[PDB]
Design a protein around this nucleic acid. Sequence first.
RNA 1: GGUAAGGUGGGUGGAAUCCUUCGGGAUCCCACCUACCCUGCC
Length: 71
Amino acid sequence: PSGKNPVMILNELRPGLKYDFLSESGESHAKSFVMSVVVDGQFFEGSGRNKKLAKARAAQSALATVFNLHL
RNA sequence: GGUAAGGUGGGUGGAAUCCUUCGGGAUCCCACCUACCCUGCC
């Protein structure tokens, strides 16, 4: 699969970044997680119900800002 | 007992960029399978 997230778009348009996962909360049926990034020296964040959703949110923010575009 | 929703681990497969002595190296994503955790309905 070529991908399903804004993560791969960013990582193909302009790679050269770092990511930092952050802790979780809630019960197993309402669980949440978060994922942050450092791109071009900027910083971004994005929580979600799972690890992929977190990175998709944070990477979409990192993309739109650093790329001066939108998803 | 059956039915449905979400999360995590493990295994396998698929996919992209960068570098390369073309043997390889680095970065990175997804799906499937299996097990586990947990909630809703009847």
